[PDB]
Design a binder for this molecule. Sequence first.
Ligand SMILES: [Zn+2]
Ligand SMILES: [Zn+2]
Ligand SMILES: [Zn+2]
Ligand SMILES: [Zn+2]
Length: 251
Amino acid sequence: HHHHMIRLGLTSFSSTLYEYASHLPLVEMDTAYYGIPPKERVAEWVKAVPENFRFVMKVYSGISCQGEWQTYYASEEEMITAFLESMAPLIESKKLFAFLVQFSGTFGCTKENVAYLQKIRHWFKDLPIAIELRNNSWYQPNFVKQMLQFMKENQFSLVIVDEPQIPTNPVPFYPYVTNPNLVLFRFHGRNAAGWKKRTLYHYNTQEIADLSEAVLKMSQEAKEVGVIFNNNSGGDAAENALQMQKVLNLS
Ligand SMILES: [Zn+2]
Ligand SMILES: [Zn+2]
Ligand SMILES: [Zn+2]
Ligand SMILES: [Zn+2]
């Protein structure tokens, strides 16, 4: 029977990846955001999980305009090659859900870095890219529809986000499919403080209920749905994810 897919995952597999892959079908690994790992480490990660476990791989900080990447890489090209060279065993493995390119609050709707998003697309050939933004100008009434169209045109999977509402930068929860082949949700929790690893939010029964409605509404319109609980304390994220899984009675 033609089933559309919803996978639930965390960032804080933190015990082990091997044991994590016993309960969950999806993980987000942030490890490479801080430094590009050697190819053979990625190779072992691949070997350590079941045949159809998926990885959301967060790209190197330099790729999303955050890293001090000049310290380690001579040019943007050398940096992309190092990342894609180390990510080879995952890319060739078919266990890649998406590369997450997650931008800062300062990365907003400008001609300059729209043209940077095009550079991202080129650098990543035909690879699945989940784009995340922290700036509401991308979402402003005026520029919002071309924005979604730009994501569609480039097959970018625009990350649907639940996150703290900063008055001066209110990034909304905008459930819309830009790439019908994969939608990624990321729930950051709703605690505004420092919007930070020491900032806690445990989603309640009503919130898990609201977010589940939206997740289902999206799986109606996408082949594969990825849900990452990235709210603080892995214990909180894991509790919330286990709640959702019950609410959607998943496998
Ligand atoms: Zn366990
Ligand atoms: Zn090129
Ligand atoms: Zn609870
Ligand atoms: Zn279908």
